[PDB]
């Protein structure tokens, strides 16, 4: 009922046969750095080339796939993370 944004789950939009509208919502805590999308084709002797997109563009488009073919994809999230060592118990006698 106020300012309390939880973790947003990934979602897909503009889905096609040879193209898809991959979209994700980065976490305010998640480091803001360009991400890399990896894709692998099974109906080809060689996989499709990856792509690098800035973090600001939580969305990206990948076309050139083939229908009826098994395409292996992988969404890797590379982020540094927030400052570690928040609050814990300090050892002391």
């Amino acid at each position: 009922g106020s300012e309390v944004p939880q973790l947003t789950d990934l979602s897909f939009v503009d889905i096609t046969d040879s193209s898809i509208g991959l979209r994700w919502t980065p976490l305010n805590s998640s480091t803001i750095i360009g991400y890399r999308i990896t894709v692998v084709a099974a109906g080809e002797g060689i996989p499709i080339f990856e792509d690098f997109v800035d973090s600001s563009v939580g969305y990206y488009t990948v076309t050139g796939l083939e229908p009826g073919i098994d395409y292996d994809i992988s969404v890797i999230t590379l982020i540094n993370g927030g400052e570690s060592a928040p609050t814990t118990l300090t050892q002391q006698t």
Binding site: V13, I15, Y71, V75, T77
Partner: peptide, 26 residues
Amino acid sequence: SSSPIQGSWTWENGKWTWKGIIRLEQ
């Protein structure tokens, strides 16, 4: 809005990665 198909998050390799069968089905 409801999507044709949706998977889930998987914890592995000391990292969070999203994987599944293949591209968006139907």
